[PDB]
């Protein structure tokens, strides 16, 4: 028999299976296409999620909110500068892409070198020691390969999480593709970055759509209702936080489209999320034209779970996750995108009243020692 009242489906089949992925940072997948035309530039970044706070800006859209002062929720992402290290050629074969030769730098720090060990405290710390004497005796044999062959080139960069207030040190290594012209000049771009900190202002700008990669915050094994968004059964023997009918008799088998109990969160996952402010760790980050009061983008009492005293970027996963950002796959203009941003006021105030801690001291006055 047919259904009775034809409702739409619970949940998408687009994302399946719903299982925790094998990766803590977001793997990129699909860099944007090469214009042999632009200069050479990096097309991605890594940063750590912090906390989000609202901001006030003036809309420039005839909407009824034209020329009015809208509050907006905004995530701060801590982004200390990613140090370029290596470079990787890629042959285009009929099977797929294929790595021809990785070249590396002379001198890596212990920040990068922790990634290669699971036990740093025991080991004698040998990684790139035979390579370093080989480098001084450099690699203009192996760079000549990448100029001759190889359609695609990618700089190996890495993070600096000693500068972050996570208790980490270990530092994520990451391929980032280079999209400009001429396969020689991509390598000359990469070569001159070796042992140089790339800042965030090199990559991204104020008023730009960014596609954000990450991993969702975990909830463990959750049931049908929370996991798939399913109707709760009426007030039912056995229980009521579950589907009643899995399946019809035939096929004599449970189909994959029916929703079940299992993992929720820790899924690898967005596109078109506007950058409002690129900042500097080097005072007056949260200060604007309007308010003119001296602030840092740390709120009072820290971001809960703390500080930030690095470069950051605002924009429209869990805390302390490594996000990656991406430059959008086509440069698009939707009026909504390509908007004049104007920030009046950034909030740096449990339930905060005061913007700054000296403002609190003025209110309460001479307190008792």
């Amino acid at each position: 028999s047919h259904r009775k009242f034809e409702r739409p489906r619970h949940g998408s089949l687009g994302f399946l299976p719903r299982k925790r992925c094998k990766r803590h940072r977001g793997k990129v997948k699909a860099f944007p296409k090469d214009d042999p035309s632009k200069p050479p530039h990096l097309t991605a970044f890594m940063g750590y999620k912090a906390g989000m706070t609202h901001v006030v800006r003036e809309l420039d859209k005839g909407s009824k909110l034209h020329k009015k002062e809208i509050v907006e929720a905004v995530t701060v992402v801590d982004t200390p500068p990613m140090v370029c290290v290596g470079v990787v050629g890629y042959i285009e074969t009929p099977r797929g892409l294929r790595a021809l030769v990785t070249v590396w730098a002379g001198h890596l720090s212990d920040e990068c070198k922790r990634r290669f060990y699971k036990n740093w405290y025991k080991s004698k710390r040998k990684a790139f020691t035979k390579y370093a004497k080989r480098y001084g005796d450099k690699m203009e044999a192996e760079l000549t390969r990448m100029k001759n062959y190889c359609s695609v080139i990618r700089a190996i960069c890495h993070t600096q999480p000693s500068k972050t207030p996570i208790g980490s040190k270990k530092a994520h290594v990451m391929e980032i593709q280079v999209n400009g012209g001429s396969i020689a000049e991509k390598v000359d771009f990469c070569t001159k970055m070796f042992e140089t900190a790339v800042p965030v202002k090199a990559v991204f700008t104020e008023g730009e759509m960014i596609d954000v990669i990450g991993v969702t915050k975990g909830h463990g094994v959750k049931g049908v209702v929370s996991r798939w968004g399913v109707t709760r059964l009426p007030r039912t023997h056995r229980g009521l936080r579950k589907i009643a009918c899995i399946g019809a008799w035939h096929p004599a088998r449970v189909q994959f489209q029916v929703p079940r109990h299992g993992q929720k969160g820790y899924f690898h996952r967005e596109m078109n999320k506007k950058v409002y402010r690129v900042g500097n760790g080097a005072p007056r980050n949260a200060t604007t034209e309007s308010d003119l009061t001296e602030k840092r983008i740390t709120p009072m009492g820290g971001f809960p779970h703390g500080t930030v005293n690095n470069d950051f970027l605002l924009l429209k996963g869990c805390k302390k996750r490594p996000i990656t950002f991406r430059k959008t796959l086509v440069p698009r203009t939707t009026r909504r995108a390509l908007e004049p941003v104007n920030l009046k006021f950034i909030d740096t105030s449990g339930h905060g009243r005061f913007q700054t801690s000296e403002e609190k001291a003025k209110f309460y006055g001479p307190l008792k020692s």
Partner: protein, 129 residues
């Protein structure tokens, strides 16, 4: 072309009646521009056109399906300036099949988003919000 506002009244709700048409009550029955969800009670926000019966009022004005517009709302909603308004009481106005109000005077406050849409209800209102 109304912006979304939290829906504070389902179809079942019985609300107050502002105007001088003589109705005390308005019992909601349906909403204009409601699509298709299984099991979802159709609900109305501030500002928007509905259908209603009067439950107590003038005897010619009872047992018919009048259109009304909703004018105050006890459910909270977010203005874009970043705070949450909510009124003391739910209330509406009996209205013609066009959209014009029937009885001219309007007691109470009204919302911003009633006066922003409907021109006539703006004029007769005492003080908006």
């Amino acid at each position: 072309s109304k912006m979304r506002v939290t829906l504070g009244l389902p179809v079942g709700a019985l609300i107050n009646c502002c105007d001088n048409s003589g109705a005390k009550n308005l019992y909601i029955i349906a909403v204009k521009g409601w699509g298709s969800c299984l099991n979802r009670l159709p609900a109305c926000s501030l500002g928007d056109l509905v259908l209603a019966t009067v439950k107590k009022g003038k005897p010619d004005l009872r047992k018919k399906v009048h259109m009304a517009i909703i004018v105050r709302q006890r459910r909270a909603w977010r203005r874009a300036e970043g705070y949450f308004i909510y009124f003391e009481d739910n209330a509406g106005v009996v209205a013609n099949n066009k959209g014009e109000m029937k009885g001219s005077a309007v007691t109470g406050p009204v919302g911003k988003e009633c006066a922003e849409l409907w021109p006539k209800i703006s004029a007769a209102a005492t003080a908006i919000c």
